[PDB]
Amino acid sequence: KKAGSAAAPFTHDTKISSELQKKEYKKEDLSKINSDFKFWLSVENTNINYPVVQSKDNSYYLDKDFYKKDSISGTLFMDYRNKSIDDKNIIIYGHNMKNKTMFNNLNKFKDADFFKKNNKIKITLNGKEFLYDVFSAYIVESDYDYLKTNFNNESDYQNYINDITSKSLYKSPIKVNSNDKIVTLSTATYEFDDARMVIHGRLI
Amino acid sequence: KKAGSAAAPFTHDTKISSELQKKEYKKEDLSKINSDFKFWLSVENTNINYPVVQSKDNSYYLDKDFYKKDSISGTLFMDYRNKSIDDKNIIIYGHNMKNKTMFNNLNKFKDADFFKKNNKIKITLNGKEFLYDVFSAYIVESDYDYLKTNFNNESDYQNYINDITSKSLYKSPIKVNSNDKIVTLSTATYEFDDARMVIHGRLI
């Protein structure tokens, strides 16, 4: 009946994802299933609990599953510019799906209270967990690209931080400086989307 | 470089779509390529100029090209409920793509000045061209399901008309009533889109 409500495509990704959640919990090595795998990602009080891959660009995995087959949800993925631990800003992209999956829940950070509750973003890499507090959340337009992974100096990075901080829908009691590391979570799509969600966390 | 801007998947759909424009101009029979083919759709002062198909639901052709292959743009398709030439409302669905293809240009109707230009919708079927005047246009939440192909009586139909007329961002000269036939063009997607375009024309 409803346009784009058919079950089989969501079932595909739902089945793949949950199976991977199990495998991750048992500490199986997911990079033996896709060498593109980098780390696991979760966010407190969301359903965001997924693997993150990376490829040559910022598109391949939007409509591809963890086994590289076509899929409407895709797999979360790190920006292709990211290289290492040391990067100042880790950027991760995902669909906003209609059964409220992938990065859909990023929308919760629009609630004033949820945002004050200070839910953490969590990255798990080779059995070591890294935590980030959200200091900035906002909504951007289809072709928003103010998303930088690396910087020439302490000063450029500070300016980027001042900028993305001033953009926040809500003021956070966390000042970030040029010695911090940050994470950026972004909605992304091949379709036109003027309501894209952008979240920034600070490494605790 | 930028998230979801990889050329290749768009190239796939541009190639197909412009070949089919050439085939339709030549008056080739497109139902020999795909049985599901129904008619041709264009809209004045837009790049909307595509083939319309129908499956047995409202999802299959969202991410399938006219050769029933995976594609990020899909193929414009008619609501499965439209069975007859005497249906009171014909309803067609399409993607709002980032490269401004498919039903992107429905968004042009958000402009008061494009709206009052009376740009007509065009259905070409078996040689015969059928023309419609756009009398309502608006934005709807991801959920919107107030899309009805048929009605039990002229009172039910008039109420439907009255309602969708009230939603228009703009008032139109054109009065619609329960003896009219109408077309409905809706943006649609597997993702969450609280900014999707619905427009309605009236058969001339």
Strands (E), A141-191: 182-187
In which domain, by residue range, is A92 found? 1-204
Give the Å distances, CA to CA, from B156 to A95, B81, B88, B150, B204. Answer: 39, 17, 11, 9, 22
Smallest CA–CA distance, residue B104 to chain A, in Å, is 8
**Among B200, B193, B155, B197, which Cα is nearest to B177's?**
B155
The data reach a resolution, in angstroms, of 2.5
Which residue's entry shows tokens 């004050």? A116
3-class secondary structure, B33: coil
Two structure tokens written together for A6: 């058919």
- DSSP, res B152: S
CA distances from A33 to A38, A53, A69, B108 (A): 12, 11, 13, 45
Question: Which residue, chain included where needed, has tokens 């499965």?
Answer: B80
How many domains would you assign to chain A? 1
Query: 3-class SS at A25?
Result: helix
Q: In this structure, how many other beta carbons lie within 10 angstroms of the beta carbon of residue A132?
A: 23
Residue type, B172: S
CA distance A184 to A193: 18
Question: How close B26 gets to chain A, by Cα (Å)?
Answer: 31
Residue burial B166-188, b: 16+ Cβ < 10 Å; e: rest: eebebebeeebeeebbbbbbbbb
Contact status, residue A204 vs residue A154, Cβ threshold 8 Å: no
The three-class DSSP label of residue A153 is coil
Q: Select the residue from B190, B197, B198 to test the A interface by mutation, using most A Cβ atoms within 10 A.
A: B190
Residue B130 backbone dihedrals phi, psi, to 5 degrees: -115, 135
C-beta separation of B109 from B137 below 8 A: yes
Measure the CA–CA gap between B41 and B50, rounded to whole angstroms: 6
* Residue A145: closest C-alpha in chain B: B2
Residue B67 Cα to chain centre, angstroms: 19
- Which of A59, A70, A194 is closest, CB to CB, to B3? A59
What's the CATH number where B43 sits? 2.40.260.10
**Experimental method reported for this structure:** X-ray
Q: Which residues contact residue B155 at a Cβ distance below 8 angstroms, ignoring those fewer than 6 apart?
A: B178
DSSP secondary structure string, A75-143?
-EEE-TT--STT-SEEEEEE-BBTTS-BGGGGGGGGSHHHHHTTPEEEEEETTEEEEEEEEEEEEE-TT
A11: how many CB neighbours lie within 10 A of its CB?
A: 11
